[PDB]
Structure 1
C-alpha cells in the first residue's frame, strides 16, 4: 500500500506500508544549573585550599628544623663554655693550693730554725 505524502521543487515523498501493526495504540531550571556549577567550584576551591594548607604546614616544619639546629649550636656553645670555666677554675684552685702547701711546710721549717736557735741561747 503506497500513500502519497508530498511533492515540491527538489523533492517527492510517499509512504509504503507492507504490513499493518499487530497491536493498536502505543504502550532543570537555570537556578538549579547555576547552583550545581557553583557547588563544583566551591569543592574545587576547598581541595585547593587543603593542598596549600598542607603545603603551608610544610613551610613551618622547615623553619622549625632550621630553628632546632640553631638551638643545638647555641646549646653546644653554652655547654662547652661552662665546661671550660669550671675546669680552668678547678685547676687554678688546685695549683694554687699545691703551691700554698709547698710554702707552708717550708715556713714551718724556718719556724723550727728559730726554735733551734732559742735552745742554744737557753744553755
Structure 2
C-alpha cells in the first residue's frame, strides 16, 4: 500500500535501486605467519613421532626374528652336545664293565694256576717218603 523506491545507481549495462517496504524496529544497527608456521610444524613433528614409533616397533620385530633363528641354532647345538656326552659316557661305562669282566676271568684262572702249583708241591712232600 505504501512503497519507497530509492534510485541507487545507473550505468551503461545496468541499473540499481533499493525498495523499502517498511523501516526497521531498532535505534542502533547491532593468525600471523609465525603462528600458522608453528601449527604446521607441530603437526609435522607429531606425525614424525608416530612413524618413528612404528619403525621402532618393526625394528623390535626384526630383533625377535633373529632371536628365533638363534634359539633354533642354540637348541640344536645343545641336542648335539647332550648326545655327544651321553654317548661318550655310555661307551666309557661299557668299556669299564667289559674290562672288569675280563679282568675277573683272568684272576679266577690265575687262582687255578696257583692251586695247580700247590698240588704239584703237595706231591713232592708225599713222595721220597715211600720207597
Q: Please, what TM-score do these two structures have when normalized by structure 1?
A: 0.98
Distance 1:38 1:22 in 2: 50
Q: Give the whole-Å Cα distance in 2 for the aligned partners of 1:37 and 1:57.
A: 31
1:8-56 deviation per Cα after TM superposition (whole angstroms, max 9, x unaligned): 1100111100000111212310100011001100001000000000000
Q: How many residues align?
A: 123
Once the two structures are superposed, residues 72-113 of structure 1 have per-residue CA deviations (whole angstroms, 9 ceiling, x without a partner) of 011111100100001101100100100010111011001101
Give the RMSD, CA atoms, in angstroms: 0.7
Runs of 4+ in 1 over 2 A off after TM superposition: none
Alignment map for 1:10-89 (pairs within 5 Å): 10-89=13-92
TM-score (norm 2): 0.92
| Structure 2 spans left out of the alignment, 5+ residues | 127-131
Query: Highest Rg: 1 or 2?
Result: 2
User: 2 CA distance for matches of 1:78 and 1:14?
Assistant: 105
